[PDB]
Design a protein around this ligand. Structure first.
Ligand SMILES: [Fe+2]
Ligand SMILES: [Fe+2]
Ligand SMILES: [Fe+2]
Ligand SMILES: [Fe+2]
Ligand SMILES: [Fe+2]
Ligand SMILES: [Fe+2]
Lengths: 202, 202
């Protein structure tokens, strides 16, 4: 993802349209934030399991990508939980069991498919509902997660295409939005402009 | 996609697995070749429509990507048609009507999803059946298409992430397998080793 002159938002970007045949149940923004957290929690468990399998399967770099992406979803959970807690103080984050893992290549595809659903269906739907209800904070959180998921999708497809051609690049994770960069060739996060110095390498 | 010491095949690559819950009806290799051609023909019509819509929407570079990918599918049709013609000289390639094109970002997602289905479901299923029936010619053709589709998927996701950050890079199409590269930084096709100077620029 290239760095634009300005931070991408639903207002200045053109990849925020939602699929017509949605597979997303849309309720109040509160309900949507909870649904997103549940999905994020499932994603974290999924990627954690995929990383474990990747290591057993002999793909150390891909394992690191799954670990970095799992960490990215934890960041999304933190952003969404902070808002939900404010909207419903006693709210308790859900626990999701580790899903089934398959061969590394298939796990990368499974990951990409989920990321695509979130960036083109779920989050855009939630963003528009938040706008409708005037919840600017939710719009911001959903936007950041949405942008990060499409980056995750691309990273997974790149890894799939080069599954037998790994390298020693590290994956740099932005602590603010979950953006992930492969390699050192970058200065800041293209999603939130966070300087590279505060990123964490995987 | 990185260039390896040798061209990728089902014999030396590890991303040829078929998703366990397949959405693909598998018949004889002859039937599968015809089914693949039908899908390729539909993809060509879809990308052609998407390209036209992209230009109307002001996305010149994305339009070029859709045009290059449409051309790539025609290459796949050629490879598959040649094999069918050998067993059934009377076989005629089908023609399909053009589908609707929506907003550019969603068209890129539709493209990516189709590419992912082909590379991780349909082609792996067809390749495996061809192997079980000892049809090496079909294994070869299905492999080339399969490898190109995952590259298409990545190119589409990359364009989606940078939908508002286009550049003047040309897309280079390999005339032999449909591989597509963005920019000039490459020496040969990572799928079939065709030299860069033989590619067609879009
Ligand atoms: Fe996420
Ligand atoms: Fe993600
Ligand atoms: Fe960021
Ligand atoms: Fe194709
Ligand atoms: Fe394709
Ligand atoms: Fe090629």
């Amino acid at each position: 993802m290239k760095v634009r002159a300005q931070v991408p938002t639903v207002k200045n970007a053109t990849n925020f349209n939602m699929v017509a045949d949605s597979k997303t149940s849309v309720g109040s923004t509160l309900e949507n934030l909870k649904a997103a957290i549940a999905g994020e929690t499932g994603a974290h468990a999924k990627y954690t399991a995929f990383a474990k399998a990747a290591r057993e399967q002999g793909y150390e770099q891909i394992a690191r990508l799954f670990e970095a992406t799992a960490a990215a979803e934890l960041i999304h959970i933190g952003l969404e939980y902070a808002l939900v807690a404010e909207m419903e103080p006693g709210y308790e984050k859900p626990t999701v069991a580790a899903p089934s893992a398959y061969s590394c290549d298939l796990n990368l595809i499974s990951g990409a498919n989920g990321e695509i659903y979130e960036t083109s269906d779920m989050y855009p739907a939630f963003i528009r509902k938040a706008q409708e209800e005037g919840n600017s904070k939710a719009v911001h959180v959903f936007t950041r997660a949405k942008l990060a998921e499409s980056v995750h999708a691309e990273r997974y497809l790149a890894a799939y295409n080069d599954i037998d051609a790994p390298d020693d690049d590290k994956f740099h994770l932005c602590p603010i939005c979950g953006y992930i960069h492969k390699g050192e060739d970058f200065e800041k996060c293209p999603i939130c402009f966070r300087p590279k110095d505060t990123f964490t390498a995987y």
